[PDB]
Amino acid sequence: MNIFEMLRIDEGLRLKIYKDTEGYYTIGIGHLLTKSPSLNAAKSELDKAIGRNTNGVITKDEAEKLFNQDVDAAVRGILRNAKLKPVYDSLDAVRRAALINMVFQMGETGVAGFTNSLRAMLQQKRWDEAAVNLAKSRWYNQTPNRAKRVITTFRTGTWDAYK
Numbered sequence: 001m002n003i004f005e006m007l008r009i010d011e012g013l014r015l016k017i018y019k020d021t022e023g024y025y026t027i028g029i030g031h032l033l034t035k036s037p038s039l040n041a042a043k044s045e046l047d048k049a050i051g052r053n054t055n056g057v058i059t060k061d062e063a064e065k066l067f068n069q070d071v072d073a074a075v076r077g078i079l080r081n082a083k084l085k086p087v088y089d090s091l092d093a094v095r096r097a098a099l100i101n102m103v104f105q106m107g108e109t110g111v112a113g114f115t116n117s118l119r120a121m122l123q124q125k126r127w128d129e130a131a132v133n134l135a136k137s138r139w140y141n142q143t144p145n146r147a148k149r150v151i152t153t154f155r156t157g158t159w160d161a162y163k
Contacts, residue, residue, distance in 0.1 A: 001159050003071060003097040007104060009162065010146050013063060017042055017056040021142045027056075028063030030104065031070060074100050077108035083115045084108065095122075098154035105146075106139055121155050131155065 011030035017039070020026045025033040025042035031049075033042040039056075047054050050062055058066075078084045078099065088099060099118075102111045114137070120130035131151055134140060140147035149161040 001162060002093075003100050004067075006097055006101060006153075006162065007067075007071070010101065010149070013060070015058055015060065015063060017046070027066075028058060029067040029070070031063075031066045070104065071100065074103040074108075077103055081108045081112050083112040087115060087118060092157055094157045094159065095154050098150050101150050101153075102139075105143075110137075110139075118154070121151075127155065 008029060013029055014027060017025055017027050017033065020030075020032065024035050025039065027033060027042075027046060033045045036042075043054070043056050046056065046058070049066060050058060078088050084099070084103075088096060091099065099111070114134060117130040117133045121127050123130075134151060135147065137147075152161040153159065
């Protein structure tokens with residue numbers, strides 16, 4: 001498996017505008033449109049990204065294109081961020097993928113604040129206390145099963161959680 005397969009699972013694929021866990025307007029593979037309650041705003045943002053006049057419905061191909069752009073963005077956010085680049089650089093392909101998923105979901109800022117818990121999770125002594133911290137984030141509380149899966153991946157460096 002890889003990052004793509006991983007998010008497709010966690011995000012699912014949706015061709016009509018939907019609302020995430022925070023009730024925000026979203027489409028395709030976890031592509032957030034806007035934080036406003038203006039469906040029009042969402043639509044407008046959509047047609048913009050897409051080009052065409054979508055009416056809030058896109059194709060699997062369009063969704064997939066947005067998906068590839070979004071994964072690239074996450075990677076760049078990581079590499080531009082002073083706290084995460086070094087972590088990333090040193091990681092193996094599986095823990096890189098977990099880290100990308102976090103950024104994908106919560107943004108570079110959110111993730112960078114946990115840098116120390118991340119590095120701690122990677123030690124042998126009390127690595128679990130570090131895991132616990134993230135459990136408490138607003139993250140986990142919103143999407144607890146996805147948080148476990150991702151954290152498990154990040155700790156183990158295997159795909160067991162996927163399974």
